[PDB]
């Protein structure tokens, strides 16, 4: 995982009655916190712009310079 999303946690009580019930969907997996990695955010690294992070606001990124700028 390049985002530390999927994690294996110290829990072993997972027995079931039917085998179809061992198919865990997204609502059965998505916990409310960061798990074992408390601070990492992939979208703070990626250059792809999302809400709250426009171009140039990721880590180690300069602001975009338009080709129409007067500076050489």
């Amino acid at each position: 995982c390049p985002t530390t999303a999927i994690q294996l946690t110290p829990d072993f009580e997972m027995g079931e009655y039917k085998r179809q019930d061992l198919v865990y969907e997204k609502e059965d997996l998505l916990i409310s916190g960061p798990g074992k990695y408390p601070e990492y955010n992939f979208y703070r690294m990626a250059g792809m712009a999302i809400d709250g992070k426009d171009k140039g606001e990721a880590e180690n990124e300069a602001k975009p310079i338009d080709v129409k700028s007067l500076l050489p």
């Binding site: 990626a46 250059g47 792809m48 140039g56 880590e59 180690n60 300069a62 602001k63 975009p64 080709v67």
Partner: protein, 227 residues
């Protein structure tokens, strides 16, 4: 024509350049700006090999295999040390400004830049400064534009303008701020604009229709069919 690559002797066509001759022989030379249909221009400087004047030459000289004819009795080396370091350095120079985008990039697993980065053996980053960024353009319903991932290999403009005859794509700007796209937002007018998603070796131009329901290339089930 007779060429000698890394001590081995090969019979090639003299009308071909060294890159296409060596690729036809199964040898692996990294390359970006050359395309079999578009010709050679010598932009990306990735296809460097070491050419010797004769058999009894030990110094040699770094040349671009796409810009060098595969003439008779041509002595070159691909696995030469200095050529390998230069190709790795070209990959590193491309990697200095490249965004940390592979998980959220539609080219991932189908990306020529990823393959050539792995092929040159470059995996360690020592560049510590900022990366240049670019604003994207709206290119219509078919092609999605992500200008951050560009390596300035000029394949898109050469295909679109010289090959396909299109008029609304071009290269703008200057030194390290080169921008490949349209002069303004709008749909790409060419009837053959969709080939940019395979012409572009990075994830700048991607299939937007595929991007709506994206999956990786290894997860695909393919068949040979007729349009």
């Amino acid at each position: 024509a007779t060429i000698h690559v890394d001590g081995k002797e090969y019979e090639v066509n003299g009308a071909d350049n060294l890159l296409e001759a060596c690729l036809s022989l199964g040898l692996d030379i990294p390359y970006f700006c050359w395309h079999p249909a578009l010709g050679s221009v010598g932009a990306c400087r990735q296809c460097a090999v070491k050419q010797y004047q004769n058999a009894e030459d030990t110094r040699g000289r770094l040349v671009m295999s796409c810009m060098t004819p595969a003439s008779d009795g041509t002595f070159i080396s691909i696995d030469d040390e200095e050529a390998k370091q230069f190709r790795e350095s070209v990959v590193e120079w491309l990697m200095t400004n490249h965004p940390h985008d592979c998980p959220v990039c539609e080219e991932g697993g189908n990306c020529h830049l990823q393959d050539m980065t792995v092929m040159t053996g470059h995996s360690f980053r020592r560049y510590r400064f900022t990366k240049r960024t670019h604003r994207n353009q709206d290119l219509g319903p078919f092609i999605s534009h992500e200008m951050n991932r560009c390596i300035a290999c000029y394949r898109c403009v050469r295909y679109y303008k010289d090959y396909a005859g299109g008029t609304d794509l071009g290269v703008y700007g200057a030194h390290d701020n080169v921008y490949f796209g349209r002069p303004e937002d709008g749909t790409l007018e060419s009837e053959f604009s969709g080939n940019l998603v395979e012409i572009c070796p990075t994830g700048v131009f991607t299939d937007k229709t595929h991007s709506e329901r994206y999956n990786r290339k290894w997860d695909m089930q393919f068949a040979p069919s007729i349009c």
